[PDB]
């Protein structure tokens, strides 16, 4: 399975059309807040 992704700007439409081998999306992801973050690699756990 080769999954794809794209960013849908506000007031824009995305059109799907297929006759087989299609994997329709079920839930979409809103982008509420944009800030600064990093995807760090570690085996540590939460420490409170």
């Amino acid at each position: 399975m080769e999954f794809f992704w794209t960013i849908l700007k506000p007031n824009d439409a995305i059109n799907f059309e297929s006759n087989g081998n299609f994997i329709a999306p079920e839930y979409a992801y809103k982008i509420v807040k944009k800030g600064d973050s990093t995807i760090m690699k570690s085996e540590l756990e939460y420490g409170n």
Binding site: T38, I39, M40, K41
Partner: protein, 174 residues
């Protein structure tokens, strides 16, 4: 010690001097003890503290490593990113070490001059009145009170009056 004030002339520090950095030891009829002059140690404190902040202030802008990931089919870019990130760290860790190494020498040499110049002005005030022993000691002639020691300490040593009694003491030993 390029200026030679530390060791050289004075090779022994004073453990009893805790009030300040630079001071004078008086051994006269009115007891003995250690005393400090503020104009010398305050400038050293301000100068060193300014230097300490300057290292922190200058190092505010530095490279900040960030995480980037690649998909196992683009390894030239991953190698390029890896060599760039650690290359910048190698450059910046050399600047920090070199800066610390040089400024350590500055502080030690800066302290040499302050105590050296402190000695220079006392010799320049006492001049013929005292004799230079070799370890920073001055042995003056006049039999004045402890206030004259304070007069040496505030850098206000009037010469003429003390010259006549001292020159009467330069002719009795000769």
């Amino acid at each position: 010690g390029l200026f030679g004030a530390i060791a050289g002339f004075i090779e022994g520090g004073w453990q009893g001097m805790v009030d300040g950095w630079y001071g004078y030891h008086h051994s006269n009829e009115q007891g003995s003890g250690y005393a400090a002059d503020k104009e010398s140690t305050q400038k050293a404190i301000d100068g060193v503290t300014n230097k300490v902040n300057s290292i922190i202030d200058k190092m505010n802008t530095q490279f900040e490593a960030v995480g980037r990931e690649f998909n196992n089919l683009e390894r030239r870019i991953e190698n390029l990113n890896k060599k760039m990130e650690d290359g910048f760290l190698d450059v910046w860790t050399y600047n920090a070490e070199l800066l610390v190494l040089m400024e350590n020498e500055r502080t030690l040499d800066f302290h040499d001059s302050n105590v050296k110049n402190l000695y220079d002005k006392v010799r320049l005030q006492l001049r013929d009145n005292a004799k230079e022993l070799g370890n920073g000691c001055f042995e003056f002639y006049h039999k004045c009170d402890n206030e004259c020691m304070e007069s040496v300490r505030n850098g206000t040593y009037d010469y003429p009056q003390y010259s006549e009694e001292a020159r009467l003491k330069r002719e009795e030993i000769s």
